[PDB]
């Protein structure tokens, strides 16, 4: 009645409750419109991470063309991941007090 | 005058057509390879959907 198990998902996934709350938690926390987060979640666009010296904004989203045309500008420091893993990296790389 | 009444016959004919469109798609995809002198008009039709 009480012993439980678990599943080790190979790819970390998002929790649909925190994404479809209206207002969703990530939609307000990550100061990003829910449409773009849904775009990143279903793997039809890219979102950049760790901008730094690149010309792009670190939280900006990109499409596939917007990624291939901009990859030639920077390929070593500019990285745009594309899956609940991206928003997980966004969460882990976010400060609370600042 | 604006509300129409349908009997068992009309609903039965409708469902017969719903099954017939599935069997139609089936016989159309099966006819994509059937040629002359290789099949009777019996094997391409199945009883299942209708």
């Amino acid at each position: 009645r009480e012993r439980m198990g678990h599943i080790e998902l190979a790819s970390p996934t998002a929790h649909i409750w925190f994404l479809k709350s209206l207002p969703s938690r990530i939609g307000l926390l990550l100061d990003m419109p829910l449409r773009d987060i849904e775009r990143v979640l279903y793997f039809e666009s890219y979102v950049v991470i760790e901008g730094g010296m690149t010309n792009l904004e670190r939280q900006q989203i990109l499409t596939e063309e917007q990624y291939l045309d901009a990859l030639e500008e920077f390929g070593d420091e500019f990285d745009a991941k594309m899956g609940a893993e991206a928003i997980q990296a966004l969460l882990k790389s976010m400060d609370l007090e600042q | 005058g604006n509300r129409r009444i349908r009997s068992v016959g009309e609903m039965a004919e409708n469902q017969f057509r719903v099954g017939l469109v599935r069997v139609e798609r089936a016989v159309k995809e099966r006819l994509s390879l059937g040629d002359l002198d290789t099949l009777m008009p019996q094997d391409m039709i199945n009883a299942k959907p209708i």
């Binding site: 499409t63 596939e64 | 995809e29």
Partner: protein, 112 residues
């Protein structure tokens, strides 16, 4: 250029969708726009033994990636044939094909 785009079909009907799209290509005589099916199910993995040593030409994900030239008519043709539920690719509806590295990778999987 004949690029290698990826297409997903109904679960199990991968080879059937492959032959259907081949018959559709041979139908509208559009061979100059497409290549071949390139069915990646080269997984001859089998189980042998007492009177049972047959092979299994299966055991692969449901992907029937086809070499073809991306175009409006080509896309509408490969989508007009039924059982083509999946057209993978991050895009509105016009995706980017696979690169030559994965081409050689799946070629090695074909040869092994």
């Amino acid at each position: 250029k004949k690029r290698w785009y990826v297409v997903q079909a109904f679960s199990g009907f991968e080879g059937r969708v492959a032959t259907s799209l081949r018959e559709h290509i041979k139908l509208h005589n559009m061979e100059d726009l497409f290549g071949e099916v390139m069915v990646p199910t080269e997984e001859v993995v089998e189980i042998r033994g007492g009177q049972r040593r047959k092979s299994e030409r299966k055991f692969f994900p449901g992907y029937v990636l086809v070499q073809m030239v991306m175009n409006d008519a080509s896309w509408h043709l490969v989508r007009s044939v039924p059982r083509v539920m999946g057209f993978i690719g991050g895009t509105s509806d016009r995706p980017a094909p696979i690169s030559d590295k994965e081409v050689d990778a799946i070629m090695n999987r074909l040869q092994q």
